[PDB]
């Protein structure tokens, strides 16, 4: 498993069993563990290790978890950002995953937003 941490706020992405997605600094939470798996030849899915849910950025910018493997909004591209940092971009909507300082998680098309930078680390 890997962890997905917001560089700016030091919060880890978490998919809760209720399907909501938020950020936490609780390193002991089992729900911050992810598996990155291939989808076709150029994309990835980001799946919760403990709940089996996939991260989804909806067209309206909300971010939640789903187990619907047919959903077209669970596909991501990971793009290097210099240093050990990456952006996590929805292929379908062109939105970047963002963790806000209040712990909410959402999507934005603004590539200059400081809250879209992530560091991926083995657990």
Name the residues that contact Cl ion, by CB under 5 A. 100-102
Q: CB of 54: closest distance to Cl ion in angstroms?
A: 25
Q: CB of 104: closest distance to Cl ion in angstroms?
A: 6
- CB-nearer residue toward Cl ion: 35 or 100: 100
Q: CB of 1: closest distance to Cl ion in angstroms?
A: 27
> Alpha carbon 73 to chain centroid distance?
12
- CB-nearer residue toward Cl ion: 25 or 69: 25
- CB-nearer residue toward Cl ion: 84 or 101: 101
- CB-nearer residue toward Cl ion: 94 or 101: 101
Interacting residues of 104 by C-beta distance below 8 A, sequence separation 6+: 22, 23
Compute, in degrees rounded to 10, the torsion defined by CA atoms 9, 102, 11, 105.
Answer: -110
Q: CB of 100: closest distance to Cl ion in angstroms?
A: 4
């Amino acid at each position: 498993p890997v962890l997905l941490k917001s560089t700016e706020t030091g919060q880890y992405l978490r998919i809760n069993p209720d399907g909501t997605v938020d950020g936490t600094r609780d390193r002991s939470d089992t729900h911050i563990q992810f598996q990155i798996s291939p989808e076709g030849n150029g994309e990835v899915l980001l799946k919760s290790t403990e709940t089996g849910q996939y991260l989804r950025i909806n067209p309206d910018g909300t971010v939640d978890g789903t187990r619907d493997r047919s959903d077209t909004h669970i596909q991501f591209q990971i793009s290097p950002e210099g240093n050990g940092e990456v952006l996590l971009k929805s292929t379908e909507t062109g939105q970047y995953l963002r963790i806000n300082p209040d712990g909410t998680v959402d999507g934005t098309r603004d590539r200059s937003d400081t809250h879209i930078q992530f560091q991926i680390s083995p657990e």
